[PDB]
Design a protein around this ligand. Structure first.
Ligand SMILES: CC(C)(C)c1nc2c3ccc(F)cc3c3c(=O)[nH]ccc3c2[nH]1
Length: 286
């Protein structure tokens, strides 16, 4: 395992849901030769959150894929999850800061990698429940990885959905309608959220174009608080949706809109999404 005393704090990397990630140097020889790693811990340790965190660690450990962040180990005294350090950070921040470097061809490369990571999740009957560019990490210019699994659940053997309603705040603007109305989560709801991820990427994370900002304008910024979810549900029911991003090819927007089907069963599979994206990639290449 990883020893507490040899883990040297460098900087705060990010915060998500109930967890917090830090950049640390694991230096067991105490000579400044150890590798830099990412360390996740609970911001406030609750027995409920500890049980969730334990399951999260088991989830990640069970995953080995090019497009999933690498598990390295755990640290015991206050449980800590040790992951590989991915030096380019979240895709959200990377894309926003370096939009001149990243073209549509690169966006589709990332899109394909996300789909392949998600198909791998589905093969283990894992539902991510929090697909968003903030949860995707960049290893290098050519490779992204699904980088957090704080909300990830395993499907029961006998059902194709999973019902969960967690205390606090949910990413409602990435949620499928049945996740908002029924608290139902499935591969199909992950596909819906993947549509939002695709939207995010093609907006190049322009602040005014974010899903929350766009939906809030459609709902009306003169919104309440508890009624926001109620109005969001109604908007989606009446086929109100995120607009086509500036400069987004019509065929890419079609993929988004097909992911955003109210009919759960009519949403494409991650396998078919990868196929469609890779086909568009090749047609943009030659
Ligand atoms: C906020 C969230 C929990 C999604 C998170 N942010 C990061 C992150 C941010 C910047 C950075 F340079 C690296 C990371 C990082 C990382 O390197 N490994 C695992 C997770 C993770 C991370 N996980």
């Amino acid at each position: 395992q990883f020893e507490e005393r040899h883990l040297k704090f460098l900087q705060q990397l990010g915060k998500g849901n109930f967890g917090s990630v830090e950049m640390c140097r694991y230096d067991p020889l105490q000579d400044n030769t150890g590798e830099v790693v990412a360390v996740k811990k609970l911001q406030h340790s609750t027995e409920e959150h500890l049980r969730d965190f334990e399951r999260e660690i088991e989830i990640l450990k069970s995953l080995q894929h090019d497009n999933i962040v690498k598990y390295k180990g755990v640290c015991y005294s206050n449980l800590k999850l040790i992951m590989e350090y991915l030096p380019y950070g979240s895709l959200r921040d990377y894309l926003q800061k370096h939009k001149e470097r990243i073209d549509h061809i690169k966006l589709l490369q990332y899109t394909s990698q996300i789909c392949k990571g998600m198909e791998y999740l589905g093969t283990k009957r894992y539902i991510h429940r929090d697909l968003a560019t903030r949860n995707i990490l960049v290893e290098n210019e050519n490779r992204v990885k699904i980088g957090d699994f704080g909300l990830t659940k395993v499907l029961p053997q006998d059902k194709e959905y999973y019902k969960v309603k967690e205390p606090g705040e949910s990413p409602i603007f990435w949620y499928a309608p049945e996740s908002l109305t029924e608290s139902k989560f499935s591969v199909a709801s992950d596909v819906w959220s993947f549509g939002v991820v695709l939207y995010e990427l093609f907006t190049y994370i322009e602040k005014s174009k974010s899903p929350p900002a766009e939906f809030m304008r459609m709902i009306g910024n003169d919104k309440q608080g508890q009624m926001i979810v109620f109005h969001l549900i109604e908007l989606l029911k009446n086929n109100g949706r995120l607009p086509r991003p500036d400069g987004c090819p019509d065929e890419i927007y079609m993929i988004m809109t097909e992911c955003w089907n109210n009919n759960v069963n009519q949403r494409p599979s991650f396998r078919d999404l990868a196929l469609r994206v890779d086909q568009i990639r090749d047609q943009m290449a030659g």
